[PDB]
Symmetry: D3
Subunit: 246 residues, 6 copies
């Protein structure tokens, strides 16, 4: 395993936010890309423009051979993303893009991850929660619902009883509650959120990118039927090209 | 995000009896929209016989069709048993399972004491389960010459995961309220004396939310399990919603106005 | 195999229609129940009352131990069911009821099977079509859709390309076209329609009702996820009750399964 | 009330939108058909990564053009629709997903060869109109490749498992009549009438409810694509919900800092 | 490709030592042939027969010189009339055919009935003689196959035809089978093996790894996680054949820093 | 319920290892077969031979009508199995565990790692000692199990935990495994076999037929048509044991038309 010294080393961030109004986008030299929703004034809720930019940034990250892991997070300590405002439903494109991204996407959550913003963290492969993080859906209370990955995939995370509770009542849940039901991967003190997140990112960066790619697709394949097969078979095709028989 | 005040949530509940004709169950309705179906055979720990199931089906259909009802509670009479299983002394409980599954309103298992065997599958079928601290859970099939290999198995695995589902079925042990909570088999555990109080609160929290959103989400979550049957529910709600829009009304309007439908006038979205 | 003489024997229908406004309900002595949409003045389109009645009639046939097969059909020779005319969308209840009926259900189709009425014939296990039969959807032409079994299950019948064509264009298809894409099981001259349908019913009636029941559930199981497992496993449970091992557990004192073999 | 032969077969006024594209042509008709044409007849319309990038760009434009209701995918000339692959090496997988999730009917108009990667492309299209000189088949196992995604599973949902295994394992070529008989294409027409017939089919769809077509396409995908299909279908449901008074009461209440009153709305059976 | 190659004579070698109920042969060009040899009972299988077929198929799977397997019946009157009623390991045989990483071809002359019909369906391809007869018998003789015999049949012929075949238990001739997509082709009885060998050789000309991956992928549309196990297993195998995958065993701390992180 | 005294009675293991080199194989009188990987020197990693022998032993247990439950374990107290020895016949063994009609219990002491971790997951139940360690290693050593090692892992611990396990390849102690539902129970190392045997005896007291139908039904939630083959296969077996099923057999045997008209048509 990597040593705590390298895992907890300072990070060399370079800004790549040119042209974005709603988000910051940064890359570290050791292979991490970070997308930060930058609207703390509205608790980092997204509007169609925000989504358009996030899609832009993620495509760039996917296409950058130096980038191995992506972080999705919100500006400040009070919110990851408090929901959608509140082309229209372009966040559905973003969900699919996170899903099919052949690199791990890690949600770094401080404060509220709510509504459309809660589905976004669920869509990420992993979630690192600050001890101040708050989670929940709001659909039925505000005249919406996410019945796609927001529902079924939530069930594959926390189980059907809990998923029905989360959606039907629309309560809020603190970090411990989220951890207890398997909704997040770990809870760390707010001060160490990014520190610990970078560590998790670095642990993955030390591993085979091809293996990670294949495993993400295999795990998607337990959910996404033929769409999941397209991903998994796609990687097999890519591997076949790299061999002699190929 | 304004939530309901606790004063409202914990206000007294008024049940009105609608049990006329039932022998094995009680059926009651609150004026604020909860329907409560109670297995009423406390002397046999609320075990169900075919008659009990017929009556619960009848009551659940009523609750479904009553536009004043938004949520249903399923429970057992007394403090000792939600339902101890099938009366051992035909298999129409399979129909009741489907009926709970496809009910467009949330169904809540309110569990005191034993939820066992067929009665355990019943609480699992309900969307949520509120358990009293004296609640006991488990299957009995392999110990009594039976099994539920339908939703009793697969769906249980979607609740507690595959390792725990195999343990529950293979050994047929009993589990206390803390055990069930820990594995995610129930949603919360509350003091026995507060069982109905907290259950009603949960119901009222749902009653404040969109009925349409709730039926859509219920269908969507069933859709993760029930293949094309799930698609039928989810798509049927989509159809219902479509009928509530101008485009979804043009066909009926055209027919009424004796003209061909015209979809040229509607905007295409991305 | 059964003798053609017996298969094509005359059939004597007994009326059980008492109390129905929109349908006829009849039973044969040899175990066929026939449900007939009786609204020729509207090409046998169904309204919510029609559906409630068909649900009632099908529930009766399910519980009648004398009935082994159900026929669904439309009155007259011009329409099986032309479409929709408890509650507004109760046809969804009826679809599920046909699906989970442990007895084979056969659509007997003369003339139009269209829209909601086309999904109905698809739901039936088999379809015997008259040479004048006409099939198709109408949803997108009249601002509606059936995205449930009306879409996915159709695709399991005719394949994805054909399913998309049927729904997206909403054309009508003759009996030959329907047969060519596997949408119906056979096409017979209009005069022979009930004759050939009764033969098919009698062929199934000669077979094991338990085997048919299990196979219907098994075939549904390829489509309906856990709902399908509920049906298939439920039949397994019923079978288990009929065995000595099942009955021992139920008689047991601590049960004693030791006297039972742990087969491979 | 049906189309009308005169309208269906009327002339089509195409407008060029190919500015900037190297490998494809892109055109739109005034009545709502967008046509993406692979423009590489010199190599039997095989695609290279740039070709795929451009098709992605064009398809996204059509998706977002509220004037467009149907998309035609085709190859330049009469000899090939697409003969396979040679911006990254496997970006055709992106294009596959984009056709899949496009809320508008996509029609493959096939003249001549639809082979290999190009065969999977026509399969992904909702419908396929084939000219009588059309030839279909896979080549992977012969050329050190395979499409085990929708190229396999989805093919089986079209032609059945026996035929799908045959097509892939032997890599033969099939003529239009063979393809028609196995359910692989929707119709076969004379080469000279290919666009004429295709446009008719497009026009027949253009007469229908765009929302209904959208929901049905997602419903049909949903029989194949698991949760990804649920995402499409449920997404359409959410979109419709926003258009209802009940949905709107939820939004209004939240924006006015008040509890919503959904009680004014029935709890249907 | 090349008619003279495809229809060239076939050189068979016997490998039947020890078998009572079957013959097992291997050609010099990489085809294995398992022949049910009980023509006096229309090639119905008894438990012994299934045991031997499992043995033979396991051998064929593990023989690197074999690229395609033919399953057939002795004589011209019967592929397999089903389970010997005079007497359930056939479920093991089904799984083995399913998970065989090489194409399995059913060469059908005469009856393929009941259990014997499920067998041809399980094979990847079916070449039928014009004298072939297909159908199920379960509901007529107190049985059913509700596993691959039901669901997978539906993935071949569609749900209407599947329900008809099972519910009525009629027999279907070669043209009927072809018309519903139940078999891949129908040929004159005298040319059955000739054409079957051609199809086999056409497959033998293609990549065995690609065929293996495609079979798993097509199974994966049906077999849930069991299908994923097959498909992902092939991907794991392919991975081992790459530099990145080798960086493990070549080390035996591994260093993946060098490898691109592709889109 | 079974008596505590009976459940905790001493075990009488009878050896059946004859002809094996990498494993021990033993049967108890009361119906438990135990397969032990016997390569303590290499933390009980498997080589192709080990797998071939485990396949042989598992097949024997399946066919032995005296056996109702199988235990899979590793020699000593330091490792259950640390994975592949540094083929893919282990894939056949996974399927063999999956389709075994008898419950299979992983009795885990110390390391269950890599290929050895998938093996415990494949078992119906896992009894873990307080010294057990779990984790995958694929991405760290240039491999992956994208089959049941992935999808089925998600059906146990949920999708978030499954991705964490695979992507980082950390090690997890027994408490962590329990909390995530990866194992069924954790017991003091000293009582590992005592407790494992109790769980086995608890199962042995139950209907073998009900157990195999339920194992198939639970597999069926994961394995599509392959799972339908298992579940339906059991239904057919049950059917054969009924008068109705048997009539069809007799009728065909006695060269006469079957008469099913004498059997009830249930709702």
């Amino acid at each position: 395993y990597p040593d705590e010294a390298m895992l907890y080393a300072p990070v060399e961030w370079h800004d790549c936010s040119e042209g974005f109004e709603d988000i910051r986008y940064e890359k570290s030299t050791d292979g991490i890309a970070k997308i930060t929703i930058n609207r703390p004034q509205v608790r980092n809720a997204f509007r169609p423009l925000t989504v358009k930019e996030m899609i832009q940034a993620l495509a760039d990250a996917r296409y950058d051979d130096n980038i191995g892991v992506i972080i999705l997070t919100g500006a400040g300590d009070k919110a990851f993303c408090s929901g959608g405002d509140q082309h229209h439903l372009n966040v559905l494109d973003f969900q699919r893009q996170i899903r099919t991204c052949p690199k791990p996407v890690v949600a770094m959550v401080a404060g509220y991850s709510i509504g459309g913003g809660h589905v976004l963290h669920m869509m990420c492969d992993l979630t690192i929660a600050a001890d101040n993080a708050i989670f929940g859906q709001t659909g039925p209370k505000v005249g919406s619902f996410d019945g796609g990955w927001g529902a079924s995939y939530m069930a594959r995370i926390v189980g059907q009883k809990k998923a029905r509770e989360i959606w039907f009542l629309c309560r809020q849940y603190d970090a411990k509650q989220a951890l207890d039901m398997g909704l997040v991967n770990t809870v760390v003190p707010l001060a160490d959120l990014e520190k610990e997140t970078v560590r998790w990112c670095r642990e993955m960066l030390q591993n085979s990118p091809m293996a990670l790619r294949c495993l993400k697709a295999a795990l998607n394949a337990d959910c996404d039927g033929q769409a999941g097969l397209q991903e998994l078979a796609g990687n097999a095709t890519m591997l076949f090209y790299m061999t002699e028989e190929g």
